Design a protein around this ligand. Structure first.
Ligand SMILES: Nc1ncnc2c1ncn2[C@@H]1O[C@H](COP(=O)(O)OP(=O)(O)OP(=O)(O)O)[C@@H](O)[C@H]1O
Ligand SMILES: Nc1ncnc2c1ncn2[C@@H]1O[C@H](COP(=O)(O)OP(=O)(O)OP(=O)(O)O)[C@@H](O)[C@H]1O
Ligand SMILES: Nc1ncnc2c1ncn2[C@@H]1O[C@H](COP(=O)(O)OP(=O)(O)O)[C@@H](O)[C@H]1O
Ligand SMILES: Nc1ncnc2c1ncn2[C@@H]1O[C@H](COP(=O)(O)OP(=O)(O)O)[C@@H](O)[C@H]1O
Ligand SMILES: Nc1ncnc2c1ncn2[C@@H]1O[C@H](COP(=O)(O)OP(=O)(O)O)[C@@H](O)[C@H]1O
Ligand SMILES: [Mg+2]
Ligand SMILES: [Mg+2]
Ligand SMILES: [Mg+2]
Ligand SMILES: [Zn+2]
Lengths: 92, 39, 93, 102, 69, 191, 395, 101, 188, 240, 206
């Protein structure tokens, strides 16, 4: 009985089996600028411009979320965006 | 059968500009349908 | 075959559609369906339904409107008697 | 009277805090991180509270996660299928051995 | 009891008949008697329509194909 | 512009005079209360209401939205189709009139004689020879709703269609002018 | 690589009888356990760099970390990940992430707020599969099996000898049998042999029942089978024990029901994993059934099941061996001749021989005796066996 | 049914005369039996009965007293209950009975 | 939020003490009014000095910042300012009129029908509760009585469902009788 | 936020179902005119106020636009052998009422609304459909049954609605729903979604003004599977 | 201050509450509730709620924001014959079934009202009645009369209702009916035309 108890105690004391995660070698990243891109770059929901409206307006399908009528930001030009292609949109 | 033969006589009349259906046309329609129903 | 059979409704037919689209983008694609009897079972009347819908999607992709293109399909099964006659038709197989 | 009033006040305060999420544990990943599955949001790698020992966070246990950080803060009773839960006798039948003859 | 009936109808005449008929058959007999009385634009049920309804409901053999018996 | 939308829900139950149970169409169920100057009797179980989006209080009631299944079970046809349209069935229309007119016109004699129910009826014959027009010929007098629920939605093999598929016939007929459930070809019910 | 995850077990104690040598062996095992406990307890306490890097990575990651699926890789530092709700986000890939293992379909780790990829969930095993893995090996060894020498030899040459001595197979030019089925009457030693195999094997052992392979939802059955075989492949030397294969291995037929066709689909996925496109790998499959004639021919065909090991009802010698094994712990009498019970007509199975011993012990307890006798054994036999035969036709 | 799964098969044969008497005394313990109650004769009057039928006999003997609006049961009530509960259904057609000689 | 920080910066441009107030009208649905005053923390001061706020007294540490604000950035980019309500007379006596209970309700006799029904209902439920109290007292099980005194606490029979109902009945009856005597004296 | 007006009711008030699958009542219409609105129109409401800000032009899904025939496959009727009666029926029920119309009204004969080509596989159903697309100037609108089956609730009904609307926009438009068995199964939770798609198809078939300029062709190898409510009298009748 | 605290306790339940399902109580002052928004929550129970109403699965009202359980909502299913759904067949409407009437009543109406006589004799009144005979003799009419004349919940099912497709749904419906009768007891279950599922059990091979 006490051998069983010791086995359980050893297992509970170690009990980690550290799960591997995609962590690069320390020399590979060594970047404090990861915080810079985390704060500066914003995530963008992907959506396909179903219909173009002619300041042009754009109807976007955010997969299952919803349909919105949006406009491009100043970064991209109207020529780049075409009907039916998937584009990234900010969450706000 | 009567409704369909009425429609089928007109359907016969679609060929050529016939805006009216003749007695021969009704006869063709019935001798078509009443025999086609057997199949 | 497991991927073509998806939990959600309409997803297997969608997967078949994207698979055939991807084959069409390439030149002279070769598609292999091993154990086609997993999804190519004969229709009946809910049963599979969704699996039958996926099989119908594959059927109309193989033959029908919108010619398939340079896509030679390959199918293998040890129980061909359970296949849908539409799928076994000599325009698809 | 002071005890009564204080008890009511702490009940109010503990009622104002939000309800914590309920999630099953896929597996414990670290000595301080657990891979849980919150329904229906999905799977999360959550941190453990200081009052919960990681060694009691066994796979497939129902842990409680705080409303904000999804922090594992209670071990909770395990999940039983509702149809299987009614199978356990809670009120024993009144038949006794002396009621069986022959 | 709920039916209008008539003075001339005597239910004991129909009760004493040897025919073996269930309570559903009794209800059907009475309903057919009412229907027969109503068909002739009569608000009273008499012996004749009750008798005809009895005879109609009693006939239950239908075909039986004449050789099973 | 200042106006804001209001969520749409059904009053499932009446908790108290000032407490209601409402289910949002694609939301959760909320316990809510009425606004104030609303006739609480209009809020039966099943009615459509417009909850406020912030306090969730019932603000106004709404007509029901026409349901799917009910397209041939609720449509009314108070038309006048003469018996000349359905030709060659004078005896059958006479018999149909003798069956339907007498109970509909004067049920007082029927309750006087005692026999209440005249239900039943049966029009077996060749298929598609004018069975529907027979009940459409009788539509000369009244018979407004005139539902057609052929071989479906009343039995479904064992019981499957019942209550909500056995009683709504009699509800939507009663809340309107007389009609004919007219179930059809019952030889193919559940098959 | 991710080598085999062999089940842990303590060294076996030989004396069995409660003598002093057994006590000494158990005390030695306890002493080593105490030494290990003391060492791994004084390690962290006696212990008084990378902390800065770990802290920086943890603050950058934040908590909680959502688990999503990587859909596409656009740039070296940008990707489209789909959250568990099905909505895809165009997120940024942080530097402290391996771009090598970042592949489409993998389970990525995302920031809760920004959703940037901050790690990859490596294991991500279905919890319904990780339960199948054997962690505590059963205590039944090959010494617990009476007779079945040919069956033991075949099962060893199939699952144990290839791992222990692959040189014979390499020199011979033959690939060792990668599939075996154990069939026979119930209570003969199929599950016993599988338990002994798991006890002796150094490979990872996965045990299923063939009824947990069936899932309520449509695609979850074949997906579960694929996940199980992927896990078996991850730990290169693996043994998969599918007990009661009759549950899903039943012969394929045209069925007008979604459930039966889905179960046939699950079996088809099983036998596509067994032998189909792509090699199966160093995964050996053991299947058990009481009714092999009801199994689909494609499932038990050579290439999937290479050795159809038969498990007949024990004969006189095997019955004697099973009685010797199952009466070893019992304090037997002197007048007890087991040969009278060993004779039988034709239908004493190994499971029955153990119930006979248990019932004999119970009858001894009834008479307040801890030493079973012959009358106890005959009463136990005529008490425990339940039967079901031709009449006096043949001469 | 193999040993290891069902180790012991315990059979419940229909109660014998003494077993039936025991069941009768068990299910008539709360009943106000008259002085001339001989429960053994009731056991003999129930050959090849089951425990449920023995209890049904007591129940029907009590229901006879209920019908007569009394709280005590007599031997006659038990005897009539024996007949009412243990009433079997036979072939009813001597044609079928006489197929087998 | 970030935009809130930007507009607060725009406001501080005019005056260094431009305070922002955030109000939650749905969270402040009851006697709790959830309001807060925020001003930005100069991120340069975060390293140039330490904390932005001197603690020269104990008047600022009597509050406890809410976890939502710390998650959203309290004490890292904005700092809370304690909320003080400047309420005075002629602004408090006016708000006591929203429920003022004009003199009529102080002399209304209710109605005797539902008063009698309420009295009867409370008396019946009190008879049942007195049966329960009688049981609870005669049981007097002495197997560690201090423990049965704590194993049966459920807001039940002994005292809570007890005289509290006596309190309600006595208060209602006394008030009704006193009002009846008052109106039979004052009115003719 | 794009939304649809599921109904319009007098107090001037509208019930809007947003693209987020939730319906809100609007105490006021918004910035547009209630008269220039009806059930089913696409309107861009506010994200949070949910108030209509402007009306939106008829928007067709990418799948619906891809459904239109642009390559115009070349298959003469000479390539079809053994089906002369069937070709004549199809051309006289789907093409002849199209480019003639007014004279069909002149005889006062109702041209059937839809055609169901049914038979054993390989009999030439889809071949005849492709030939009809070849030798007609109408805007062919091909599709399949499995296409109108999607995960999201109401997506199949929306798909068939946009298909029929695009068919309406082009005056000479033909809809070919190949492999009708996928959605035409007998009435029996993806079953609910498939049923919603089927009833939406029935509603679109019934909503046609009689002898309109849009004809529907459907093909099926299994008719016993097909729901009997599909055939009926106003819907597909010519079971070729 | 105590009065103010009681008022706040009352104000905790102040109308806009989300209905939730009670899954299981972790311990006193705490429970796991399933909000009808679709996600499970670990919440705190107000002490003022009477604990015996927390059934293993009962409809409870949750605070809109804190999600805490603050109230328990009060509870036709398959038939559950309602007061307005009574068959309205009186015993007088039945013509001359005195033996059958008395035998049926002594088992299905007397125990519910006059249980004292059964206790005095101590006989465990009969729980099951089988009415049989030629069709149209008045069995279902007598069951209707019992339904109209009883103070207990009446459940009316047909033996053919139990025979369904989707194996495990027939016995599921049988168990549902009996559990429904258990919940609101006393109750009467009438299984008409049970002869469908009543045949002598033989060695079924399909
Ligand atoms: N040859 C044998 N030698 C020793 N013990 C045996 C032998 N055969 C069976 N037994 C005993 O019988 C018990 C039950 O048998 P086992 O678990 O092997 O069944 P099985 O062959 O898998 O059949 P089933 O799956 O139908 O139960 C084992 O635990 C073991 O103790
Ligand atoms: N009557 C016919 N005359 C000429 N070619 C034919 C005929 N019937 C079929 N074919 C040819 O045989 C093939 C049959 O495919 P088709 O698309 O016509 O099938 P279908 O009748 O629509 O059936 P399914 O939907 O089951 O595939 C085609 O390649 C077509 O050219
Ligand atoms: N004794 C009776 N008194 C009055 N009506 C009866 C009697 N017996 C039968 N009926 C009538 O016969 C019909 C058949 O009764 P019911 O019990 O439903 O059929 P079954 O006996 O086959 O179950 C009932 O509608 C009832 O009105
Ligand atoms: N005698 C008739 N006179 C006029 N129209 C008829 C006649 N018989 C059949 N019809 C036609 O048949 C159709 C009705 O068929 P119906 O008899 O209702 O079929 P079913 O009985 O299968 O429902 C109507 O459209 C009608 O035009
Ligand atoms: N040996 C017995 N002694 C006393 N009462 C018995 C005995 N056997 C049966 N009974 C009575 O008869 C009834 C038998 O029902 P039950 O034992 O549930 O049937 P089964 O054995 O077929 O499951 C019980 O209510 C019990 O009170
Ligand atoms: Mg086994
Ligand atoms: Mg085709
Ligand atoms: Mg009946
Ligand atoms: Zn803000």
């Amino acid at each position: 009985d006490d051998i069983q108890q010791l086995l359980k105690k050893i297992n509970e004391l170690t009990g980690i089996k550290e799960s591997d995660t995609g962590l690069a070698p320390p020399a590979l990243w060594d970047l404090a600028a990861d915080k810079q891109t985390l704060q500066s770059e914003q995530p963008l929901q992907v959506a396909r411009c179903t219909k173009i409206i002619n300041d042009p307006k754009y109807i976007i399908n955010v997969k299952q979320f919803a349909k919105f009528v949006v406009d491009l930001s100043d970064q991209v030009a109207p020529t780049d965006i075409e009907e039916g292609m998937r584009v990234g949109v900010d969450r706000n | 059968d009567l409704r369909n033969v009425c429609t089928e006589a007109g359907m016969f009349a679609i060929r050529a500009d016939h805006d009216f259906v003749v007695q021969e046309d009704f006869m063709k329609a019935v001798r078509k349908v009443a025999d086609s129903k057997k199949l | 075959g497991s991927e073509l059979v998806q939990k959600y409704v309409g997803e297997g037919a969608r997967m078949v559609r994207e698979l055939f689209e991807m084959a069409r983008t390439k030149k002279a694609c070769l598609i292999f369906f091993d154990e086609i009897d997993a999804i190519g079972g004969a229709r009946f009347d809910g049963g599979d339904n969704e699996v039958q819908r996926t099989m119908l999607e594959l059927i109309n992709q193989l033959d029908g409107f919108d010619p398939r293109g340079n896509i030679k399909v390959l199918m293998a099964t040890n129980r061909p008697d359970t296949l849908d006659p539409a799928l076994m038709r000599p325009g698809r197989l | 009277l002071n005890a009564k009033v204080r008890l009511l006040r702490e009940e109010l305060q503990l009622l104002q805090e939000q309800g914590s999420y309920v999630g099953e544990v896929v597996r414990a990943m670290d000595k301080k991180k657990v891979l849980v599955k919150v329904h229906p949001e999905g799977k999360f790698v959550v941190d453990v509270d200081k009052n919960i020992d990681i060694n009691d966070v066994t796979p497939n246990c129902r842990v409680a996660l705080r409303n904000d950080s999804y922090t594992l803060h209670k071990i909770l009773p395990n999940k039983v299928d509702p149809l299987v839960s009614l199978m356990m006798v809670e009120k024993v039948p009144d038949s006794t051995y002396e009621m069986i003859g022959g | 009891s709920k039916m209008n009936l008539s003075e001339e109808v005597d239910l004991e005449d129909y009760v004493a008949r040897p025919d073996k008929i269930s309570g559903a058959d009794i209800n059907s007999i009475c309903q057919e008697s009412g229907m027969l009385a109503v068909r002739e634009n009569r608000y009273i049920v008499l012996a004749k329509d009750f008798e005809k309804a009895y005879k109609t409901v009693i006939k239950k053999d239908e075909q039986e194909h004449e050789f099973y018996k | 512009l200042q106006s804001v939308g209001q969520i749409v829900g059904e009053v499932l139950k009446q908790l108290t005079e000032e407490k209601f149970i409402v289910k949002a169409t694609n939301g959760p169920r909320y316990v809510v209360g009425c606004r104030r100057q609303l006739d609480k009797s209009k809020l039966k179980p099943g009615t459509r209401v417009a909850l406020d989006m912030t306090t969730l209080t019932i603000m106004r009631y709404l007509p029901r939205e026409v349901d799917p299944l009910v397209y041939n079970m609720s449509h009314e046809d108070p038309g006048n189709v003469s018996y000349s349209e359905i030709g060659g069935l004078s005896e059958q229309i006479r018999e149909l009139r003798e069956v339907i007119e007498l109970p509909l016109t004067n049920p007082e004699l029927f309750q006087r004689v005692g026999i209440i129910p005249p239900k039943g009826c049966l029009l077996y014959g060749p298929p598609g020879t004018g069975k529907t027009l027979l009940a459409r010929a009788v539509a000369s007098q009244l018979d407004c709703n005139f539902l057609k629920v052929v071989s479906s939605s009343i039995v479904d093999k064992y019981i499957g269609e019942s209550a909500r598929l056995i009683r709504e016939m009699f509800n939507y007929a009663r809340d309107h002018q007389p009609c004919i459930i007219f179930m059809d070809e019952i030889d193919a019910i559940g098959g | 690589t991710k080598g085999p995850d062999a089940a842990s077990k303590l060294p076996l104690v030989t004396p069995h009888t409660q003598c002093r040598l057994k006590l000494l062996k158990l005390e030695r095992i306890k002493d080593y356990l105490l030494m290990e406990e003391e060492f791994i307890r004084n390690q962290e306490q006696m212990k008084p760099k990378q902390e800065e890097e770990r802290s920086k990575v943890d603050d950058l990651r934040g908590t909680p970390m959502s688990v999503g699926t990587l859909e596409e890789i656009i740039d070296d530092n940008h990707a489209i990940v789909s959250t568990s709700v099905g909505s895809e986000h165009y997120v940024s890939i942080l530097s402290f992430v391996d771009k090598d293992l970042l592949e489409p379909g993998c389970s990525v780790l995302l920031n809760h707020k920004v959703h940037a990829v901050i790690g990859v969930l490596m294991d991500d095993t279905d919890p319904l599969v990780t339960v199948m893995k054997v962690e505590k090996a059963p205590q039944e060894t090959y010494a617990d099996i009476g007779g079945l020498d040919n069956q033991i030899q075949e099962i060893k040459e199939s699952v144990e000898l290839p791992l222990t001595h692959p040189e014979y197979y390499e020199e011979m030019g033959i690939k060792p049998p990668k599939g075996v089925i154990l069939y026979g009457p119930p209570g003969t030693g199929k599950t016993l042999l599988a338990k002994a195999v798991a006890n002796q094997t150094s490979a990872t052992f996965l045990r299923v029942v063939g009824s947990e392979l069936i899932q309520k939802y449509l695609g979850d059955g074949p997906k579960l089978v694929r996940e199980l075989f992927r896990v078996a492949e991850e730990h290169a030397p693996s043994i998969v024990f599918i007990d009661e294969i009759d549950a899903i291995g039943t012969k394929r037929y045209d069925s007008n029901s979604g459930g039966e066709r889905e179960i046939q689909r699950t079996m088809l996925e099983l036998l596509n994993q067994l032998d189909g496109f792509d090699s199966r790998g160093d995964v050996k499959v053991i299947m058990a059934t009481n009714r092999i004639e009801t199994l689909d021919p494609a499932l038990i065909r050579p290439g999937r099941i290479d050795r159809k090991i038969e498990f007949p009802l024990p004969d006189e010698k095997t019955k004697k061996r099973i009685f010797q094994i199952h009466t070893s712990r019992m304090t037997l009498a002197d007048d007890v001749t087991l040969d009278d019970l060993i004779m039988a007509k034709d239908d004493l199975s190994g499971a029955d021989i153990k119930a006979i011993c248990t019932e004999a012990g119970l009858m001894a307890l009834r008479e307040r005796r801890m030493k079973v006798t012959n009358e106890d054994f005959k009463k136990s036999k005529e008490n425990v066996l339940y039967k079901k035969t031709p009449e006096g036709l043949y001469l | 049914l193999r040993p290891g799964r069902i180790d012991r098969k315990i059979e419940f044969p229909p109660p014998n005369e003494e077993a039936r008497l025991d069941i009768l005394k068990i299910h008539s313990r709360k009943m106000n039996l008259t002085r001339g109650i001989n429960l053994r004769k009731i056991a003999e009057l129930m050959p090849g009965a089951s425990g449920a039928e023995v209890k049904g006999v007591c129940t029907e003997a009590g229901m006879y007293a209920l019908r007569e609006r009394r709280v005590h049961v007599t031997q006659e009530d038990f005897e009539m209950a024996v007949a009412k509960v243990m009433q079997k259904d036979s072939e009813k057609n001597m044609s079928i009975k006489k197929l087998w000689k | 939020s970030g935009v809130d920080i930007n507009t607060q910066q725009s406001f501080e441009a005019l005056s260094e003490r431009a305070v922002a107030v955030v109000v939650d009208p749905i969270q402040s649905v009851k006697g709790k009014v959830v309001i807060d005053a925020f001003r930005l923390i100069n991120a340069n001061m975060m390293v140039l000095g330490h904390e932005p706020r001197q603690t020269t007294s104990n008047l600022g540490h009597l509050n406890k910042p809410s976890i939502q604000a710390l998650i959203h950035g309290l004490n890292r980019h904005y700092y809370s300012i304690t909320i003080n309500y400047r309420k005075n007379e002629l602004e408090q006596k006016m708000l006591l009129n929203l429920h003022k209970k004009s003199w009529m309700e102080g002399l209304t006799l209710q109605d005797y029908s539902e008063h009698c029904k309420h009295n009867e209902s409370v008396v019946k439920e009190m008879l049942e509760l007195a049966k329960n109290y009688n049981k609870a007292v005669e049981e007097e099980d002495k197997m560690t009585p201090e423990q049965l005194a704590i194993k049966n606490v459920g807001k039940q029979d002994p005292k809570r469902h007890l005289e509290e109902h006596v309190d309600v009945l006595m208060t209602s009856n006394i008030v009704q009788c006193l009002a009846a005597m008052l109106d039979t004296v004052v009115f003719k | 936020l794009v939304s649809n007006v599921i109904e319009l009711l007098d107090v001037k008030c509208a019930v809007i179902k947003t693209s987020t699958r939730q319906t809100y009542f609007l105490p006021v219409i918004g910035l547009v005119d209630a008269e220039k609105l009806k059930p089913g129109d696409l309107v861009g409401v506010n994200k949070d106020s949910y108030l209509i800000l402007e009306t939106l032009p008829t928007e067709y899904d990418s799948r619906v636009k891809a459904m239109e025939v642009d390559e115009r496959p070349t298959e003469q009727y000479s390539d079809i052998g053994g089906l002369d009666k069937q070709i004549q029926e199809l051309v006289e029920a789907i093409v002849l009422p199209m480019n003639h119309k007014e004279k069909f009204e002149n005889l006062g004969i109702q041209p059937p609304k839809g055609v169901l080509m049914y038979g054993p596989p390989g009999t030439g159903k889809t071949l005849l459909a492709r030939a009809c697309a070849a030798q007609t100037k109408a805007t062919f609108l091909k599709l399949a049954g499995p296409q109108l089956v999607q995960m999201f609730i109401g997506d199949g009904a929306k798909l068939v609605r946009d298909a029929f609307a695009l068919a309406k926009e082009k005056a000479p438009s033909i809809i070919f729903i190949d492999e009708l068995d996928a959605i035409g199964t007998k009435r029996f939770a993806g079953d609910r979604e498939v049923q919603r798609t089927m009833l939406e198809l029935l509603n679109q078939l019934d909503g046609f003004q009689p002898n309109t300029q849009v004809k529907v062709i459907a093909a099926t190898n299994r008719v016993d599977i097909l729901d009997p409510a599909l055939l009926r009298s106003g819907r597909l009748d010519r079971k070729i | 201050e105590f009065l103010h605290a009681q008022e706040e306790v009352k104000r905790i339940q102040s109308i806009p509450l989300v209905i939730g399902q009670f899954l299981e109580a972790v311990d006193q002052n705490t429970a796991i509730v399933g909000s009808t928004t679709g996600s499970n929550y670990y919440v705190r129970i107000l002490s003022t709620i009477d604990r015996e109403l927390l059934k293993p699965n009962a409809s409870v009202a949750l605070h809109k924001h804190s999600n805490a359980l603050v109230d328990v909502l009060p509870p036709s299913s398959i038939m559950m014959l309602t007061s307005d759904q009574k068959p309205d067949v009186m015993y007088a409407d039945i013509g001359g079934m005195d033996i059958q009437k008395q035998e049926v009543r002594e088992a299905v109406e007397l125990p519910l009202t006059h249980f004292e006589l059964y206790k005095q004799i101590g006989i465990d009144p009969p729980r099951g009645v089988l009415m049989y005979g030629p069709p149209g003799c008045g069995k279902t009419m007598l069951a209707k009369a019992v339904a109209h004349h009883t103070t207990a919940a009446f459940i009316r099912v047909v033996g053919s209702e139990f025979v369904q497709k989707y194996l495990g749904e027939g016995p599921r419906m049988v168990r549902d009916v009996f559990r429904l009768a258990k919940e609101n007891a006393p109750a009467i279950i009438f299984i008409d035309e049970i002869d469908a599922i009543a045949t002598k059990r033989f060695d079924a091979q399909t």
